[PDB]
Amino acid sequence: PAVTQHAPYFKGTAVVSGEFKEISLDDFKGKYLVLFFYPLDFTFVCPTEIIAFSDKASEFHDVNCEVVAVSVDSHFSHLAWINTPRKNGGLGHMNIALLSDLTKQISRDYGVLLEGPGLALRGLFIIDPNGVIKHLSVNDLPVGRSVEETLRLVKAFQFVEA
Amino acid sequence: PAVTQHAPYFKGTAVVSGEFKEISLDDFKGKYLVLFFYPLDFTFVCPTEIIAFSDKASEFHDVNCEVVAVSVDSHFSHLAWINTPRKNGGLGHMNIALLSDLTKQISRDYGVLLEGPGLALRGLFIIDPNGVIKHLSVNDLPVGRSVEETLRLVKAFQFVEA
Amino acid sequence: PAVTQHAPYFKGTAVVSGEFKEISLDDFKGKYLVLFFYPLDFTFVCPTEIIAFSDKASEFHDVNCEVVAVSVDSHFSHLAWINTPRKNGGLGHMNIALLSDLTKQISRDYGVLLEGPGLALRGLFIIDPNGVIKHLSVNDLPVGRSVEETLRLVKAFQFVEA
Amino acid sequence: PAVTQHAPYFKGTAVVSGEFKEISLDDFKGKYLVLFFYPLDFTFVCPTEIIAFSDKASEFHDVNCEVVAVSVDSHFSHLAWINTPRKNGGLGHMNIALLSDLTKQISRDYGVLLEGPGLALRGLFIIDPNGVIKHLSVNDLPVGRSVEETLRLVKAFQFVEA
Amino acid sequence: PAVTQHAPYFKGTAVVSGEFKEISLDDFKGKYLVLFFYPLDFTFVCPTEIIAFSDKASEFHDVNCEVVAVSVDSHFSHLAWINTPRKNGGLGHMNIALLSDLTKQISRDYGVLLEGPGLALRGLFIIDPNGVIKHLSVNDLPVGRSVEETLRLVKAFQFVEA
Amino acid sequence: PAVTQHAPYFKGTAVVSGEFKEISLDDFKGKYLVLFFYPLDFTFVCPTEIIAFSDKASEFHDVNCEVVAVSVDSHFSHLAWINTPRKNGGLGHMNIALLSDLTKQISRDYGVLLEGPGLALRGLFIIDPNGVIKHLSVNDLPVGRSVEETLRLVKAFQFVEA
Amino acid sequence: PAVTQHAPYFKGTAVVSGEFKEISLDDFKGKYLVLFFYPLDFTFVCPTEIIAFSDKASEFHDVNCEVVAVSVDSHFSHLAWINTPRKNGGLGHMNIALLSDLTKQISRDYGVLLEGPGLALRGLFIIDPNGVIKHLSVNDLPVGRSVEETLRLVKAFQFVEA
Amino acid sequence: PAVTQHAPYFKGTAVVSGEFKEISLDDFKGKYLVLFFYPLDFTFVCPTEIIAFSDKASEFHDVNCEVVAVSVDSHFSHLAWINTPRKNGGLGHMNIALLSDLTKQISRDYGVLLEGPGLALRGLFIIDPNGVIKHLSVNDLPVGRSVEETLRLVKAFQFVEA
Amino acid sequence: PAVTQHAPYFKGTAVVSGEFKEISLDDFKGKYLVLFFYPLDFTFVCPTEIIAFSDKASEFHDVNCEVVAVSVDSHFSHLAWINTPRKNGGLGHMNIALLSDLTKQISRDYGVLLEGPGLALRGLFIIDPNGVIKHLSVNDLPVGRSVEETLRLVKAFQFVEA
Amino acid sequence: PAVTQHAPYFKGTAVVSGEFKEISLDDFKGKYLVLFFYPLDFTFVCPTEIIAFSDKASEFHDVNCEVVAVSVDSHFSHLAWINTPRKNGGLGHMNIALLSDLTKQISRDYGVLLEGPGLALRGLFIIDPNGVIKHLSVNDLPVGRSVEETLRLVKAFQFVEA
Amino acid sequence: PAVTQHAPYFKGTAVVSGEFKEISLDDFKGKYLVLFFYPLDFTFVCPTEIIAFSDKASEFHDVNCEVVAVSVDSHFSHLAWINTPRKNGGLGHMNIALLSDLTKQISRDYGVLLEGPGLALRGLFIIDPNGVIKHLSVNDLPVGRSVEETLRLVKAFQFVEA
After folding, report:
1. Which of J114, J144, J160 sits opposite I143 (nearest CB)?
2. Among C150, G43, H5, H11, which is least packed by CB within 10 angstroms?
């Protein structure tokens, strides 16, 4: 999983709307994908960064880019978090797909999986319409990404490709 | 070279002031290090991002953080570029170390070395006082990092460590 | 296989990155080579010493020295062991090549092969850029080498050659 | 090793349950034995045929027949493969003994050892309670046996012996 | 006569239609050959397996495979057995060649000749269009092969060769 | 790389005019080629000898002789040096090709590559129209060649060739 | 002389205290023996390493290990060198036995004798109380062993034997 | 035999004055040596270049530099050539040593020996007071070196060494 | 090379008249050949025996016998010695071929080559019109053959062959 | 058995006077020895040459040289031939020792033994007082040596040795 | 090695002044040589007799005679003994060459080597300018030669040679 190669294939249940949906790398063929990982659902540290993406989500759609968050949690946990109101630490309505990686298999293939505790690092991948990774960020567990910065980067790769 | 392991060792000649100096990973023991890689000296795409770090360099020193840029070029090439005035595409005066990786070994060990052409990708590592990598970015060849963002990240890691 | 002669020739499939690659003694022409034998993959006694080299690998690289580990197992077992997380007794990401000696011919040529059980002793060879063996260790099966000492020795021989 | 003579003696470490156990031809005195060879552990081509036997294993037990698989790998590799879940190319739980032929000696004696690469052909022997070989199959490396057919054959030899 | 080598030369008189005809290994160049041995003509044990091949014969022709039976009998015995109606233990109309090995030489070269009594074991060989043996069965005298299974193997080797 | 065998193949980016161009050994078929290596660009020791060739360049052209310089530097570094005025240590206008050996591969094949530091020795090769090496010079790093002498040598090999 | 066989027999005159004494392998029955070879007395390269052992000698006695140095010189030379003060290149007081191998025999038997010059390589053997060799080092003539590391190795084999 | 390693040892009978003398590389310890090879005595192509050195011989002695010419002829051939007056193709009086390499061993060691015809190429080596090669030339058989250029080069290496 | 076998093949340049000429064993098919070896040209010991053959040369032609001398010298040395007047130790006009064995191969094949110094012993062979050796002499370096006696032997073998 | 090495040892019964006596190479220590082989006793071709030596025997004694003839016959045959009067093809009184080589061993060691028929060729060796062979003749079976010439040769070697 | 034959060849490192120098028998061509052997350096019994010669050394030089002392010790020991002041048993300044026979080969060839202990007997040879031994002395180990007597002998041999 390095910067000029095709991103590893993934399949898995996500929470797409208020519903469970099979999603794979192929569904993003010909689209820009911001795939990003976070440790665990219901953790005090994570929600703000995911919510930020959920907000700006449309900004990405305009520039022809999907955003899917992923963690090692069951898709049931994903739901239960969406169904928690932001007020009490939850996610609320979400505009980005929430992918379950119950199998730990996806986080392993993106080489972001801490095998010790068994949850993913804060990795982010920008994958172009041909399924080529153009960028990756990896942060240690307790530190959020800038959603603005990631948006800038997607646009920047589009610029240089036309 | 991944997020929570010690950064690989590196030694080599850098242009520290107007002068050549042997610098190693050990020199940054008990300090934060922002090690970042760029393809080649004298390329039309590189200078703006390196300059950007040279400027905000003090900001980093304040929060106890060194910045060293690296590329597969000779330390003589590094000097020449420094000695080019910014006006004519150069780098001019530099506040950050410019490390030579002539033997390609450092770029190799940070896993940023495109073996094909023999030059590094735009990788950036944030290394803590204990020599642990806390963050890595990798951009494809033609796209600059945000100096501002990097700095925010360094600070954030100290916050969460106190 | 004695100290001041050219190291016997070898060829064979190694796990070089995540990938199988043919490697021979000739590939290390002009470089220093630390060639080292271990009994078997998936043994409770071996992994720590092999990991130890994989970690300090960059240290060797800087001083123009390659490290390749070898044992009588198939390159398929090598991969499988690399693909085991260190947590559960595996090797994990490896920074050195893992050479397969399926035919037992390499271990035989370096005179480290216990013909009885059919596996190598813990031999280590330091071969210079001209293919001359400058040092050899051989330990009985259950006892590991010091990676630090081996590095000191590689450096030492370079000193004495300039 | 031909059809009406006694099968060559063999001794070696096998993975019997989850455990290592010394097994020899003598342990199968007064029982039918299906001894069968496969190239290497962790190869993409082998697992399906071995699994196939592991499943129908009981069918053989009922008709008083043991099944032991063998290859030139260490008994450690054998275990590691058993401990890989079928999902990811492994063997999973095994109902048959997995014999290690580290010394290549058993494959040599049964005349199935390709000396070139140093691994066995896909040979299968049906040995009766008196240690007499009644049947042998040998397939080139890439082609699996029919477990059903082998079972039919064992039954058939018992029929004709009563 | 082992699996990956060229099958030994053979020449001799066969009963091809109702006629005697010289055949040799060469006549099966660029075709698949199932060459199989049986003990003796007019034995109560043999006819059912031979007949079984005769029936499915065409199935083999379709996949570009010849089937020739062989035994140490004179080609006159062969004919006499063809001319015995199936009803009274004979062979009846035959769709495969019946090769005579009067000199015992063919059975010797394929290593299936019991020198004691002077007849062949129930050996079978699958020889590919290049004259390379890809599979061999040998059964003790009283037990038949499965025609179905042998056909599956022929098909399997063609598969893996395209 | 010895005297009466064909010069090893080489391909690489050169600074031909003011411009970058792909050049290989084949481009010199049917002509005399003086291939010569120098350590690094922007070193205080190197420029006088290169300049020397650059001047007498035409003398060589007259006798049907190309002159290409080479070092381990990027072709960008090359350009930058050309664009430095001779006054301030640079090359200025260049009449000879400047070949980049970024991969260190060319220097490795001509056997002039000090692997330790990772630059070339001051090696010179005279290669005839049929790609046969007729002469080689190798000087330690700090001592220049006489252009005059090299020219005489070229003439000489032609003299003797009819 | 390899790792798991008994160390070859040896008898010879050593400088035990200030006195000559016959010592043989037997005198070390039931003790650990560090038997190590060096080239020649009164060489500018040797003394430091020998001294190093003499100093830590006690450390070895504590863990039940003898240390005897050996070289092809007469025991008279040994004494003479012991009697040279360290100040002027000599050995001074010695805590280890210095064995004379005048006949070159002991070095021949431990397969450390360079027949050309007629002196020994820098070989080191760790022999256990049963006369079994557990470890061997051999360094080319100009490079010293680490005394610490050898000490660590002795301890380690004792650990593993209890 | 390459540029920065010690020149291979050589011994052999030379014609020193009008007299035969045993000379070895050791005789040139702490002096500069220009060792140069030529094909055969009494060839029409060779004499002019050897004479040229014999003339400027003193110039080299001044700058503390020996010159020995060597070819695969007997030292008797050497003498007879010296005893031929320049007038009729000879060498006449000689100010340099003429070394005999009858055994072809010296020419082999310096890697200049055409094994085919059994004679040397026109090689020249500059060896410093420590026995290190600083320069090598190799011309194909029919083309002379410049004695002046070689002289310049000797001085140049002394310059840079002080 | 022993008496009743065919004399080993030989080819090489000889000095036939005043001219160089290729000769081989074949040119002496159906003729008697006296092939004789001597140490070196321009030695004070050799010339008298060679001259002796040159004189009686015709005596040999009459009885249908060629005489060729040989030694490890170049054919240029050969000529130079022919051109030295007998007066001052030379050969003068020669009536026999003088074969060059520059490669030492001929002298090796006839088993007369002293490998130590690299020259031939004083061997002589009488080879008959069928290339069969009928007689051989070998003398230590300082002692001559009798031409008269050798002629008597040639005559004697013809006698006994008619 | 070649010219400058020690003559192979030999022991055996000879007919010394009219009597049998054990003689070995040692008995000729400090004397010159002409050891010469002949095919068989009682052959029509041999006697004249042996007689010839017997006559001039004293001439050899005077110059301190022994002469012993040898052939593969029993020492009894030797006697019987001595006891045949010259008149009827015999040898008559003999002044030289006649050595029996019944075991064919001596002729084997001197490499003159035709293994086919089992008799010696007409070989002659001149061995000096130190046991060094200075000369060897070998003639095919039907042709005699010149005794005069052999004597001249013995004298000649003494001359050159003083 | 006996009285009227040529002294066996010898080569080896000697301590000639305060320096190491290769010396061989050839170096003494045309001079008289007194080669004399002694047991071991640093023995209490030897020094007086060596010193004795060192003193009268010039007496020998006058009558055109060299004196070289030899023992089985390393040339390093030889130095150390020279550098020991006579006062404390040493040799002090030496006026004769001290030859090292580390390989025991020279003492072997001169037949003074006690193989048992591996050291030389007190043998002395007087070799004339042609390399012929004219006198030898051998004393048992503990007894010195009279230097005066040996000098008288050298003179006597010169007398009788003119």
Report:
1. J160
2. H5
